[model samples]
Target: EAHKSEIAHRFNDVGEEHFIGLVLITFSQYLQKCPYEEHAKLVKEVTDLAKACVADESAANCDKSLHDIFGDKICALPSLRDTYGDVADCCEKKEPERNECFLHHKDDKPDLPPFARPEADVLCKAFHDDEKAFFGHYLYEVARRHPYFYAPELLYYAQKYKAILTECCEAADKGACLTPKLDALEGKSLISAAQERLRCASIQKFGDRAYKAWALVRLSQRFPKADFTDISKIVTDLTKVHKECCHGDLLECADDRADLAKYMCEHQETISSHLKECCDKPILEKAHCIYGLHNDETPAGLPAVAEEFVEDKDVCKNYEEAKDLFLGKFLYEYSRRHPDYSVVLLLRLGKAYEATLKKCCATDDPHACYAKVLDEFQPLVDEPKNLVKQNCELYEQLGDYNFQNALLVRYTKKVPQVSTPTLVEISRSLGKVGSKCCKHPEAERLPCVEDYLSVVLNRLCVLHEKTPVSEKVTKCCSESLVDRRPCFSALGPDETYVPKEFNAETFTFHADICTLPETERKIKKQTALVELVKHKPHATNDQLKTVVGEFTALLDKCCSAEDKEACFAVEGPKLVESSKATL
Candidate 1:
């Protein structure tokens, strides 16, 4: 059936499309190990029939499609037919209505006769007869009673039941052992079914843009360091898969849902480690697992704010001359330095200033009116600046080695664009400051560390202007040394910070890369990864993973080859071409 037309049918009923989908999926699953030998001959026929069945087929065509096949194959046998029972009244009616009545009349069908959550002995009594047929019966019952359940979901339910039977049947307290699992299973099923149904119905009612926007925003907020185009492409695939999944193609839905997680997982380099565990989950469980992980980490002992937002107010002239341009620069300049602050927080601060600017701009003596306004904005950064000081205190306590590793690991999550080398350089510099200042100071190491720390931070500010981090990086970088750490601690990543080439090298495989010391090999690998990002700065994580996979494969092959020179000579350019092809 046409996707759009089928959607319109979902205004109320579990649309005919859904009915066909569940029935067919169940029928095909039953045939998977259908002890009936003839199903071997007709497996593909039923599978194809299921995939082809649409919502709007004529009544006669519908009967010609399913009733004959189902009646002849399984129903012809007295045992199976009796188990399934009959919709005798519907048989007298027209095909379309008969088919609708067949599925819609839940109580009349004995096909899904249920003994809900029976004890292990009771459940196992029926099941021990034949597990081969057990699989068939499970699928049949679930498909009938749990009409909305997807076939893939049914297998899980089947397994859950089997697992309970195998363990609990032999247990002393089968009720305790089996009941919890069965209860939880029932809970998960209801919620899971409700969730998928609501998702499907919601999509039809409100439309696809809502989902697309949702995926876009989640990806945007979580991996703020990744590219927009990259995020958009993931959302495109995300949107496409759910269109089928919500329509009862959940078999595909489970796997396709992982695509977004795969992208998010690829960015372990830039997102919170607390959230990284979702990557290891099953494909079906992944996408929503990390939904609440917002990458927010607000530490204790923060001052009221980071820095005085407005040091001086040239507001009347700056505002009158160029409104957006002036505030645009102001906001970005503010955001650039504090790369650690969230987009929402930064915008909130900007609006506060924008409010102050307009109110003061209207006054007769704008200079005097805005001049006292710096105190109003002081509270904004009051909490933030103290946070930097608290961080500085930790720098003193943790010592060089402790904080050095902390800085490296922390920024790896914050700045994916900063190549491992550049990040290492910046952080190692901080680590060294600890080594020198904290050497043996009895008086106040705080005095010495802050003095050198300012230099390290000032150097970062000047470094990234042309290299260009985010507006957040630029803003934080421009801050005085006292506020630099505070700004960075507060700001979130700039979505635009995905690397677009900030000094990288061409790929060249040679003898030097082979049989190198362990440290050099590690560095070389990291450098290749960095250069790879620099080369195709627009590539998604998977795209980068693909090209880098080839690069490493080639490296291993050539490095291990009997003739390293010849191996590299032949394979070297292919690595670069592989990357450039992503051109």
Candidate 2:
């Protein structure tokens, strides 16, 4: 509360920018206190003040001089080594004479020194090396040995107490501020590395909650002037970093939630009042601003705030409709204008519509008609293998084979128990079915069958000379080259062939041992679609690596360990090698 009031004054009186610099300095000071404890309390108090400062012109600033007032008190208190003693006897008494006290006590620094903590020193050596050189200089001049700041013995334990307070605050709730990455720099930077060490030590004793509390207190005090603008920018940067690591879009709503939530809770009344008082200020305008948040449960697919973009409901609805039409029509115009982004632009528009339709469908069923309209526009839902693989469970769930039968009608009009189609046709259908399961029933999958088959077939032709008519083997085969088609079969327990089909030069088999039954396949496909369409992009190799490893183990169960090893030698490198061969 004190911190909030203090900041309110500084921001109105000194302007927001300078007020922020002061807060940063304040944070540094809190880290220096008589004991780590006192410094921590100061941090929260200061931060709260900072928020108030931003919103009100008449708000008060913290008048306490960790240097002047506390210093005078330590000195006047008899023989007591504290802030009053140091200032009363030395610093305030004779500024020139007090200079010698630091030289004598530099190495054996006491927590309660007579003077204010300087921005330079040995304790802060790492800080000196980093951009935080001010801290290094501060420590060198003050924290060492002298009780001029305060008495170390008395104040030292106070700091330990402050640390506990920090734990309580941080653990109890996140305070409003950006996340502090005190450890990201490590050996690369001095201040960050040193701070990281301190953070680790604090966390080891108090755990992240308490340690974070301590950090929040300090952040609030130091950064009292930071507002929605700076916070938004910081989050944006962090999101980019996350995206780089994740290789696609990363969900970041939580970052905004955590930081802003802490901020709102810490200064609830001040912010509410401030918004009421200053919402009309023209000069206070900040670009790309997002402020004031509170938690509540709302149904998904509904706008968070209907009146966010416009004051009138009609205007808002019209604006949304117009924006949609613009996006739809301009995408075509833009595609004509920019050849390079054409494909990506198309993808972006598709992704957006797909997402909207999925959300609408999930929220209610009438939206299905809208989805169907988009389905024709995209042409992604017609593939068969996808239809059967992903919707098999859905078909079963319908308690009849209606969906599967519909898929059959869509393809050959034959029931599922009869002759299955080629893998190519099956895959095409399955891809469509997969897309339909989640966000985009209309999203076309990136063309991957060409890439996949090229690899599979190239390997087949290189290894076996089986022609469509000549090298054929079983009942699912043709003697005449006229009626011939490619057929696939599985090997028996003795490794003998059970030819299901015959005719073509090369047949492909993706015999995964972890083969899910039709029902399970549907379930698995739905789960995958949920992850892909609802949450993020498709899974990467890292995610599949675990599944691959598990599936490979199952392969061992189906085949002997020796046979498995032999298959890898035959299958893995052979596929890679086949790229050079013609299919």
Candidate 3:
């Protein structure tokens, strides 16, 4: 009687039976769990907010009103379901009409993108009506755009009714059916479920037999003119690569099989030869190569003979005669590090280096030149000044080689090309710069290897295609090789580099996102900052909002339209400390 009277009195002015009943039931559940002392006060607060939102026609207004009242803790509220139910009611109509309303409220921008599909009610109906339809719908939703909310919520519901889903999908042999397999998982970690979900998606897209056939086709197409014996050897090695990558970890392997297949098939010769060469060497040398490959797998790069030599200069000293073998290692590392490097570049570099070695070392004092290359290289392991000067000198000498000149020849192969000689000169120049910069540590190297290389390579492609180079391409190419290094110094995803602006190079954050309109960038940035604050839930919103406001103002002041990267890089960090102090 007391609960009923309070519910009636609370919703007295805005009295709708559906709305009143919803509040009564929701508040009853909330009160049962809430502390007995706080129940009356909490009920009044919730009822007051509900009454305020009762007049708003827009679902968004109601949604936002409820969201402001409960925040993230809304997930714990019993009234939350009724809130979503009420929002859904606003779009309650048939077919195109309901979809339009839903899309206008949910899918359209400036509002949060519909986390669930706009036709969520229809899916909800299917979920209640047929288990199999529900399972298929769930997977389809996951593999579609915006899967973050759907995955966890669907998994939660699936786990809640394990027996129903498990039994329903038992007869289904396809990928969607594998949702049942998730129920049998022991620890039931989210990653384990996600992995299973991804595995199911992979199997659906490329079943076992189909994937094998795809690999064979790709391998065949990639090396169409290769010898039959070479193809057979590659095929046999691919089987082994598959076994190693897939047998024990099917889920992880499935995630990257296409890439793995391409990698293994493309570099089949490198893998086989590296294994044999390492195993053939005396125990110590063999041990070093084995250790090197494993260490190379860690962190963001690949292993080259040059890198290995740097790793163990003492051991490398005795192997001066085996410089060809070192170059072989360099090719293997280059393939992994720059998977997209043109085959022309790879073949040209290989032939050029081989020809250069033959021509240079064929001289009467050949060993002395070889000895000079090694002597200067070995000492750089410890000396800082020596590192830069010796490496620069070494690159300059390497620039003199037939390899650099051979790039000039490859450039000439395309006829009627404009200033062909000039293009070749740029390649030779860039090659020298690349030799110095790419071999250095990540910090000392360009921020994005692929981006810098792409700019050069793509321009070359345009030139070969006889398309006039754009002003940007000409400017990029015309820049000195050393100067070009900084152009790539700050390349990466906007998010990874943005926070670094809080320290220095603040303009990079603005410059990277400058492609977006100002309003969109500000909105995107504010959303990101809100998420960052959400990570620290215990922090007061007032403190975090102040942090956001201060940082955003700094962005407005420092991140100018012209030379935003340069400006932010200098001034971005100034306001970061004050924001940190607020936090």
Could you give candidate 1's per-residue lDDT for residues 1-583 as a string of tens digits? 4233322222113333333333444344333223333432343444344334443433222434344444334433433433333544544556455545444443212233234544467766667777745655555545544434444455556666677678876778767787788777765664444334433433543478545544454455454444445656766786776676544443345445545567768876555565566788754345556643543333334333323334445556766788755654455444433444433344445667678778877888766665655456557655644544565666778776557655654554456565466666567666666565555343334334543454455445444543674456666654332345556666553345544553324566567788565545644555555555444444465665676578768877877789988988878777766676764
lDDT agreement with native, every candidate: 0.52, 0.31, 0.38
Please, what are the lDDT tens digits per residue for candidate 2 over residues 1-583? 3343333433455444333333333323322334433433443454565565456635554443223322333343343345323333354444334433322222212345344322223223333255333332333233222111211111222233234334433343322210132122111122222222233333332344333333322222222233333423343443332222121111122222234434443454433333333233222121012221211122234232212322233332333557543333323332322222213223343444445544443453533434343335343322322433445456445433234333323222111122232222333333333233423222222212211222232222212222222233222222211111122212111112222322221212234423434444343332322222111122333443333333344344434545554564455444323411311
What TM-score does candidate 3 get on C-alpha atoms?
A: 0.23
Rank order by lDDT, top first?
1, 3, 2
Instruction: Evaluate residue 272 in candidate 3 and report its C-alpha lDDT on the 0 to 100 scale.
Output: 41
lDDT of 1 at 554: 80
TM-score of 1: 0.35
TM-scores, all models, native as reference: 0.35, 0.18, 0.23
> Cα deviation of 313 in candidate 3 (Å)?
20
**Residue-level lDDT tens digits of model 3 in 331-367:** 3333334323332233333344444446545666544
Q: Give candidate 1 regions above 4 Å deviation.
A: 1-115, 132-162, 216-231, 250-255, 258-583
Off by over 4 Å in 2: 1-181, 184-296, 300-321, 324-583
